[PDB]
């Protein structure tokens, strides 16, 4: 059974602006999600300094990108700190409020959409290329949970009995818009990664399917 | 909650012989599993001739091989007919009895282990390289289930609330022996596939992880 929650209204507004914008450089979403992945990895590593056992649920520290062409899905995974049910609700449904409000004001004055992660709300840039997202997350402190949004005013959180087990960390599962399926292609994915992420401390793994 | 079942004793015997054998050409397991995958795909396609809706749960017809190095796991997937809970029990725990008995007699006389799929029991050759297997299966007729064996006399079947959803078909998840980790490597995997499977009607997809 799902539970339904309301977004802070300013987040809803930002999602509306992003999902509908004709902004041309949609590729910036990948930089923002890799940056969030890298931050979540920094947290578990720093946390582990005083609690090394925290690492044991998933000792490999990575960012992993997995196109799933038949489902028109792109997944961005990290083995970072992960989020509890309460953290998914709070991180994704609430605390972005102040950053989103400041960002929308900047946008009104003519700020580039690419400034979004300087306002600390780069997560929502996924709506440039996707019309739906599932955030699947496993924290050492909770069960695995699925947070789901379609850019509307409400989101769901559901105990996860349907997805692969993450040892620890987070998968952003992006349901790509029909005109943004280039983000399923290995050459395109590599090209975007290479541009705006050379100083990532973690391996960035691309999962490719090849016919033998 | 798992349920526990007993193997037909001759299957238990065959698993013991295979898991312990010093037979040198262990690579033959992959041919046997690809052959079973191809057969299961033939069944859903033939079934669909009169019931085209059967295909809709997973329209792409494929065999897919996925090394998971950190877990020391190799997965072999097909989108074939799949198995219900009752079929997993019967196909894997029971009906192999007659083939296994005939095969063990052949082996006593000096038959090559590679003859195993001519006795219709090639599935058990996975124990050349693995000491544990989960068969994760989704039939159009049932929920997703996990059948699990460690070559002992009993197996478990558990309703699946932990793995990715298969639309339809079967994953063999092989937990590789510590000396058989070469089967995690892309070059090795491709080399074995190419030898003893050129007349497979279905794409054979290798899922490789590459650092960008
Ligand atoms: O708030 C988040 C990111 C904010 C920056 C740093 C905080 C990290 C710890 C929890 O965040 C996460 O697990 C996490 C992630 O792994 C990937 C993501 O794309 C997102 Cl959006 C999040 C949630
Ligand atoms: O008995 C099986 C194979 C016997 C040959 C043909 C019967 C196919 C229909 C059901 O089998 C399956 O789904 C199936 C599969 O997809 C892959 C496998 O490795 C195995 Cl072992 C099986 C189970």
CA distances from A42 to A36, A47, A142, B125 (A): 10, 8, 20, 43
Q: Which residues lie with the beta carbon below 6 Å from any ligand 2 atom?
A: B 33, 36-37, 39-40, 43, 78, 80-83, 91, 123, 170, 172
Q: Does residue B128 sit in helix, strand or coil?
A: helix
Q: How far apart are CA A165 and CA A73, in angstroms?
A: 18
Q: What is the CATH number of the domain that holds A203?
A: 3.30.565.10
Tokens coding A51: 């609690």
Q: How far apart are CA B123 and CA A100, in angstroms?
A: 55
B120 a known binding residue? yes
Q: How far apart are CA B164 and CA B206, in angstroms?
A: 18
**Burial status of residue A25 (CB atoms within 10 A of its CB: 0-12, 13-18, 19 or more):** exposed
CA dihedral A156, A160, A163, A169 (to 10 degrees): 90
Q: Does residue A205 sit in helix, strand or coil?
A: strand
Count of alpha carbons within 13 angstroms of residue A189, beta-carbon side: 24
DSSP string, A114-161: GGGGGGT-GGGGGGGTEEEEEEEEE-TTS--EEEEE-SSSEEEEEE-S
**Burial status of residue A171 (CB atoms within 10 A of its CB: 0-12, 13-18, 19 or more):** buried
**Total of domains in chain B:** 1
State which residues form the domain around A167: 1-212
Phi, psi of A142 (to 5 degrees): -150, 175
Q: How far apart are CA B212 and CA A62, in angstroms?
A: 12
- List the beta strands (DSSP E) in chain B: 3-6, 63-68, 73-78, 130-138, 145-149, 154-159, 169-176, 204-211
Q: How far apart are CA B128 and CA B180, in angstroms?
A: 9
Tokens coding A73: 């899905």
PDB resolution in Å? 2.2
Which ligand 1 atom is nearest residue A40's CA? 8
From which experimental method does this structure derive? X-ray
Q: Does residue B206 sit in helix, strand or coil?
A: strand
- Contact map slice: A 112-171 vs B, CB within 8 A: 161-165
Q: Are strands A169-176 and A3-6 parallel, antiparallel or unpaired?
A: unpaired
Among chain B residues, CA nearest to A212: B204
Q: How far apart are CA A188 and CA B111, in angstroms?
A: 52
């Amino acid at each position: 059974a799902s539970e339904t929650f309301e977004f802070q209204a300013e987040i809803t507004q930002l999602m509306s602006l992003i999902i509908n914008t004709v902004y041309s450089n949609k590729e910036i979403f990948l930089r923002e999600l890799i940056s969030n992945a890298s931050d979540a990895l920094d947290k578990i590593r720093y946390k582990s300094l005083s609690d090394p056992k925290q690492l044991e649920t998933e000792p490999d520290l990575f960012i992993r990108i997995t196109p799933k062409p038949e489902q028109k899905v792109l997944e961005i995974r990290d083995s970072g700190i992960g989020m509890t049910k309460a953290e998914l609700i709070n991180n994704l449904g609430t605390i972005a409020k102040s950053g989103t409000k400041a960002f929308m004001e900047a946008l009104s004055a003519g700020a580039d959409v690419s400034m979004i992660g300087q306002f600390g709300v780069g997560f929502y840039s996924l709506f440039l290329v996707a019309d739906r997202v599932q955030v699947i997350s496993k924290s050492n402190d909770d069960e695995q949970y699925i947070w789901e949004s379609n850019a509307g005013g409400s989101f769901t959180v559901t105990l996860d009995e349907v997805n692969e087990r993450i040892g620890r960390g987070t998968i952003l599962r992006l349901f790509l818009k029909d005109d943004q399926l280039e983000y399923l292609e290995e050459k395109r994915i590599k090209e975007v990664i290479k541009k705006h992420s050379e100083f990532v401390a973690y391996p960035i793994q691309l999962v490719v399917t090849k016919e033998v």
